[PDB]
Design a protein around this ligand. Structure first.
Ligand SMILES: [K+]
Ligand SMILES: [K+]
Ligand SMILES: [Mg+2]
Ligand SMILES: [Mg+2]
Ligand SMILES: [Mg+2]
Ligand SMILES: [Mg+2]
Ligand SMILES: [Mg+2]
Ligand SMILES: [Mg+2]
Ligand SMILES: [Mg+2]
Ligand SMILES: [Mg+2]
Ligand code: NA
Ligand code: NA
Ligand code: NA
Ligand code: NA
Ligand code: NA
Ligand code: NA
Ligand code: NA
Lengths: 38, 120, 196, 144, 325, 63, 66, 123
RNA sequence: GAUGUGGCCUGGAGGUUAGGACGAAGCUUAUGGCGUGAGCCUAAGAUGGACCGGCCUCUAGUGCAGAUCUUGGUUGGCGUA
RNA sequence: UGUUGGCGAUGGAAAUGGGGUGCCCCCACCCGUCUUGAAACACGGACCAAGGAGUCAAACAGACGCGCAAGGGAGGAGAUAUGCCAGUACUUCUCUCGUACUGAAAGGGAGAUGCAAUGCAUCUGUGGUGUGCACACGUCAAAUCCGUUUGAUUUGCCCAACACC
């Protein structure tokens, strides 16, 4: 079950990184939109 | 010397166990739990195999091919709840657990219905 | 309606599956398709592509050519590293013009009886592709080789023999019949042996 | 097999791959190699240069048995020696003997590098072959 | 090198043990078997043709145009119903067939000696895998072993009753019964042409010479073979490999001298050795699942509005600043 | 298109086939948000979030 | 019974396009040029080949020794 | 036994493709033959003529081959044929062959009733 | 005009699996079901009376609407000239 | 994704699909042919059954399948299992295509490197240069579950192949 455990641990590590990347991209888009409007 | 992959390549297209009627391909094999013509369920050529069969009365008999007495056709198959049947099969072949479970349930239901129509 | 004129002239003709009837060839293709799909190496992709080809496009190779190219690679290689494994998707034939060869490991689809005997006598090993998949699953430290195609009689016949600059053989069963007119200047003319 | 032919694929198509305009007729260009000088001249001249004419002297009663003369090369000489004698061979001592006319050859030619010294019995030999074998360490003996 | 038991003809007891010949480990090439069978089955054929004068024994001529009939040759004369009728044509009644058949059609075929030997070897190797025998169609459920080797004392039998008792003891009677029950009258025109009955194929019994066949000759559904001349048309009926063969011990020990091994040459077929295999181990799933391959396999990875304007969810997903405007 | 000389001399030669003019910010925004598709692996894919744009262009100036 | 036209010929020629010319560095033969310069060029090429063989031998010896 | 549920069957076209002008000649069969006349109106695709079969008339693969009862037909010839159907109960129904006699039909019908296997033409 | 098709169909051969006097082949159809189609399959016969189906290979005198096509039967004109 | 009615209580029922015949609104020139052009005042065309047209042999070539490979393979014939068996099993010698070409012919007849100018010496070897799979050694980007991938390029050897010698 070592392979399965490694797989599930890696997936649990990847989901949070995807969420963090989404969160960062949202802020970057907000800032750029504001400056373009100005 | 001659492996299961080679044998499957040799018999996939014509065999006495392959029934191609209409456009449907079934299997006549007595050691097949499904009827599908695939290498997983072709139990007559695999090294290890297990099949669930109906027995006298309400008994359920499981026939197991251990894989050590192949090349001795008279000693190839030695006989032996649905969870118990599945655990019995999974010792020989783990990938034959779900189908054997469902087959045991279906055999029990067939026996019950036969007893019903016998009483009627 | 969309204007897509001359869009079928971009289509390419590839093979994608084998016409061979050999079950062992089919087993090898089954192994190396999986390897090429699940591995990042280019060796596996090339080998898979060459297993699908036809017999005429897998030309045989020679023991003398193998020995020569291996030596030319070896002269510039560190003295502590090991020699590679020669791999050919095809047949390996013998050469009576070279008597003594080094000890090499060769992998091929087929060996002549004489080629096998020569290799083992010199002190090497003849491998199969299923053994190679277990020694070098990615193809590290290998020498991929191809056999020669030109010099075939069909290739030397391709073309028109009677146009200037052309040196292809004609289709004729009598060797003394087609000489003279169009081949000698004493007759009407002679076709020119060179053209820019 | 008749079931693999093109005529089985063409049942129902009237013209069988020959067209409605120019039909399929008996002999639309002549019979055989007719017209090699008039209306098939481009074909003849571009694919078969040299078909027409004469060249050379004649030879009224040719017999090939007196003209028999096959050839073999120095780098090919090892096909005529057995493996054990080839291993036992070495320049300076006792060498194997090869009989060309018994093996089916008449002349010895001198292409390549000789892979084993030996004594060769031949009906004919060339200058380079003789010189090369003498340098290698063997010899050539004329026979009849 | 594996070993094979030898069974007694009168009981369920093993008598000796013999090593397995190399021909049974030789490679199996069903494509070669099918090719050689297709071309070898053509050599026992006879010629047929029509007469060279048939359909053309009249003095017919065309009537031309001007008379309002089609331009086909017509039979001459008067006084019979055949006068003025069409002649000389595949389209006419009583006419000549299109392209009459000749007797110099190619009836027979040539096969390379090495390819014939290869096919025989492959069929022999396939006749030792018990699943291929079952797929071909034999009933071998209660058979002691495959290959089945039997003592050499059955060559002294003199009565078919003794022969049948031996067959029942060895348990070939199931396949013999299959053959017996299959017999019938053939469908189609063939039963008018000396081909009236059909039946299945049973077991084949191989003997070291041509002696001792008197008791077995009449048993329906059993075929007899000589080890010195083995026939591919019998080792692979229909072009399918996997016949059921019963070996006598002496023939079993002669197999190695007849066919040679992977290194030593045959003493009978001059300069013939068993073909080398293309794969050393033919199990590619084990290689695919091994640890050496799995260490290098690539790691696995983790895996509706459309308007964009006037859909607030999509608009705010694309442009998070629309709130502050 | 860019409205320079090499492109103006191309637009002048196919005039009976086209209509053109100078767009505004509203027009550009509407045509990107409503009817904008990308070329991803040679396929036509509709724009649905900013992650596709970032992955396609791989340039810190286009995210 | 004799007619001539150039109507469909441009379209036929452009179906598989007009192929461009071969690059000038390919098929750059010198046959038929000025013989006095041709001979001197041949001599220089021979010397160059000898030099290349010597250079490779030197490289091999250096790699082997060190 | 009840079949597995599926989507609704659509059947793009119900009418058959019959040959051109077979209604005027008794000897012409109604089966489809492709018209290859140079002036043929059916081949030239005029407005009021009949249609020719295409690949676009093909049926949805999710429901192809399914009969109105919800099963698919598998032909059987004797009693032992039902044992290979006993496991795929809700997918396939058996069709007794035309030439099986009454004596065997009785046994087949009884066994199928015991095993709970649907017969398309049972009794 | 070219090519492809675990694309359809007909007579025979090597294999394999099956059916039939409790009714084979053939024939009839407001007998439905399946397939884009060539076609396949079931039903009924208040038809028939002895043979024959599926699958894998092999083989050929292997698919008809028209040729002033060939042979046999029929037909309007017509109870007319 | 649930909710409310109608019909349906085992019938000669209800319902939904097929099939048949009539009707209404709309659409719609007669097939095969040759021809630049046919619905043609251009030819063939009363109905049905059965028959009816790219085939066999032989020489050569290209593509694809199979066996062996500097060799491949007979044919004719023989010998004994063999006396069901026109098949299958076995075979010395030879013959043929190929490994070498060129000249009208008499005839002649192809390795590399170094040193010299029918010369001499060595023999584990691409005759040289340009463009060139894979493999090996470095370096840099992008992405990343941080383990590696996907790319680029430098150098070594360059297999097949093409260009110039
Ligand atoms: K003209
Ligand atoms: K339909
Ligand atoms: Mg050559
Ligand atoms: Mg003269
Ligand atoms: Mg008898
Ligand atoms: Mg027409
Ligand atoms: Mg016939
Ligand atoms: Mg009707
Ligand atoms: Mg015919
Ligand atoms: Mg030559
Ligand atoms: Na023509
Ligand atoms: Na014309
Ligand atoms: Na006749
Ligand atoms: Na037209
Ligand atoms: Na007809
Ligand atoms: Na015509
Ligand atoms: Na017309």
């Amino acid at each position: 079950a070592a392979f399965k455990q490694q797989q599930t641990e890696s997936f649990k590590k990847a989901v949070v990184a995807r969420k963090a990347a989404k969160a960062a991209l949202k802020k970057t888009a907000y800032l750029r939109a504001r400056k373009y409007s100005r | 010397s001659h492996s299961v992959d080679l044998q499957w390549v040799l018999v996939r297209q014509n065999s006495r166990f392959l029934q191609k009627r209409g456009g449907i391909r079934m299997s006549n094999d007595p050691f097949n739990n499904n009827g599908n013509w695939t290498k997983r369920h072709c139990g007559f050529l695999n090294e290890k195999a297990a099949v669930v069969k109906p027995a006298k009365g309400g008994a359920i008999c499981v026939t197991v091919k251990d894989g050590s007495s192949n090349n001795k056709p008279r000693q190839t198959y030695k006989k032996t709840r649905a969870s118990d049947v599945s655990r019995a099969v999974a010792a020989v072949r783990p990938d034959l657990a779900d189908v054997s479970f469902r087959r045991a349930r279906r055999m029990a239901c067939i026996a019950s219905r036969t007893a019903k129509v016998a009483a009627a | 309606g969309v204007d897509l004129t001359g869009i079928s002239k971009k289509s390419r003709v590839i093979r994608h599956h084998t016409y061979s009837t050999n079950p062992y060839i089919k087993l090898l293709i089954k192994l190396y398709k999986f390897l090429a799909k699940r591995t990042s190496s280019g060796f596996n992709k090339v080998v898979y592509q060459r297993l699908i080809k036809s017999r005429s496009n897998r030309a045989p190779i020679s023991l003398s050519r193998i020995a020569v190219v291996m030596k030319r690679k070896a002269v510039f290689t560190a003295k502590s590293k090991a020699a590679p494994i020669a791999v050919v998707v095809g047949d390996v034939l013998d050469d009576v013009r070279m008597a003594r060869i080094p000890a090499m490991r060769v992998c091929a689809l087929r060996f002549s009886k004489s080629a096998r005997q020569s290799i083992v006598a010199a002190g090497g090993e003849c491998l199969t592709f299923d053994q190679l998949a277990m020694i070098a699953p990615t193809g590290k430290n290998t020498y991929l080789l191809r056999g020669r195609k030109s010099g075939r009689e069909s290739v030397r016949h391709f073309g028109a023999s009677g146009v200037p600059g052309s040196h292809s053989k004609p289709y004729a069963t009598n060797r003394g019949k087609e000489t003279k007119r169009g081949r000698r200047t004493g007759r009407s003319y002679k076709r020119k042996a060179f053209r820019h | 097999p008749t079931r693999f032919k093109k005529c089985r694929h063409q049942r129902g198509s009237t013209f069988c791959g020959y067209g409605r305009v120019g039909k399929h007729r008996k002999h639309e260009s002549g019979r055989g190699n007719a017209g090699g000088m008039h209306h098939h001249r481009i074909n003849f001249d571009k694919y078969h240069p040299g078909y027409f004419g004469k060249l050379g002297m004649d030879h009224y009663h040719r017999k090939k048995n007196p003209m028999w003369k096959p050839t073999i090369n120095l780098n090919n000489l090892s096909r005529l020696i057995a493996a054990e004698e080839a291993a036992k061979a070495a320049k300076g001592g006792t060498l194997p003997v090869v009989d060309l006319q018994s093996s089916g050859y008449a002349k010895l030619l001198g292409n390549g590098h000789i892979q084993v010294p030996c004594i060769v019995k031949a009906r004919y030999v060339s200058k380079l072959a003789d010189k090369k074998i003498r340098k290698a360490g063997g010899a050539v003996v004329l026979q009849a | 090198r594996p070993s094979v038991s030898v069974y007694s003809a009168s009981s369920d007891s093993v008598v000796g043990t013999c090593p397995l010949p190399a021909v049974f480990t030789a490679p199996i090439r069903s494509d070669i078997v099918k090719f050689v069978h297709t071309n070898m089955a053509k050599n026992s054929r006879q010629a047929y043709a029509v007469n060279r004068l048939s359909g053309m024994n009249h003095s017919a001529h065309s009537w031309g145009t001007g008379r309002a009939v089609a331009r086909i040759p017509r039979i001459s004369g008067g006084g019979t119903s055949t006068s003025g009728a069409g002649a000389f044509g595949n389209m006419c009644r009583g006419g000549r067939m299109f392209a009459p058949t000749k007797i110099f059609r190619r009836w027979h075929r040539k096969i390379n000696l090495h390819q014939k030997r290869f096919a025989v070897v492959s069929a022999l190797a396939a006749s030792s895998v018990p699943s291929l025998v079952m797929s071909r169609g034999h009933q071998i459920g209660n058979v002691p072993e495959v290959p089945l080797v039997v003592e050499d004392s059955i060559q002294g039998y003199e009565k078919t009753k003794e022969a049948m008792a031996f067959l029942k003891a060895i348990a070939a009677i199931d396949d013999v019964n299959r053959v017996n029950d299959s017999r019938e009258i053939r469908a189609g025109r063939g039963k008018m042409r000396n081909r009236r009955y059909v039946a299945r194929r049973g077991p084949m019994l191989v003997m070291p010479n041509n002696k001792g066949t008197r008791a077995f000759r009449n048993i329906f559904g059993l075929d007899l073979a000589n080890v010195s001349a083995l026939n591919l048309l019998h080792l692979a009926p229909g072009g399918h490999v996997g016949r059921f063969v019963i070996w006598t011990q002496s023939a079993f020990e002669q197999l190695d001298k007849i066919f040679g091994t992977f290194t030593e040459a045959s003493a009978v077929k001059k300069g013939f050795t068993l073909p080398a295999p293309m794969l050393t181990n033919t199990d590619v799933t084990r290689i695919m699942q091994s640890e050496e391959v799995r260490r290098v396999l690539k790691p696995k990875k983790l895996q509706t509005p459309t308007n964009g304007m006037k859909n607030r969810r999509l608009r705010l997903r694309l442009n998070p600043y629309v709130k502050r405007e | 298109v860019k409205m320079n000389k090499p492109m103006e001399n191309m637009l002048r030669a196919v005039e009976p086939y086209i209509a053109y003019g100078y767009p505004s910010l509203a027009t550009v925004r509407a045509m990107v948000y409503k009817r904008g598709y990308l070329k991803i692996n040679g396929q036509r894919v509709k724009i649905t979030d900013n992650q596709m744009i970032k992955d396609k262009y791989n340039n810190v100036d286009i995210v | 019974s004799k007619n001539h036209t150039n109507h469909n010929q441009s379209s036929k020629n452009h179906r598989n396009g007009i192929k461009g010319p071969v690059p000038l560095h390919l098929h750059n033969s010198k046959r038929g040029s000025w013989l006095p310069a041709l001979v001197n060029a041949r001599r220089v090429r021979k010397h160059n080949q000898k030099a290349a063989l010597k250079k490779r031998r030197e490289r091999i010896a250096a790699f082997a020794a060190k | 036994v009840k079949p597995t549920v599926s989507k609704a069957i659509v059947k793009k076209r119900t009418k058959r493709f019959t040959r051109h002008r077979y209604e005027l000649f008794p000897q012409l069969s109604s089966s489809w033959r492709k018209p290859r006349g140079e002036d043929s109106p059916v081949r030239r695709r005029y407005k009021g003529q009949k249609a020719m079969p295409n690949k676009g008339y093909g049926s949805d693969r999710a429901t192809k081959y399914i009969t109105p009862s919800g099963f698919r037909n598998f032909p059987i010839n004797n009693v032992e044929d039902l044992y290979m159907l006993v496991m795929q109960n809700r997918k396939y129904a058996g069709v007794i062959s035309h030439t099986v006699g009454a004596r065997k039909r009785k046994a087949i019908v009884r066994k199928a009733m015991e095993l709970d296997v649907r017969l398309a033409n049972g009794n």
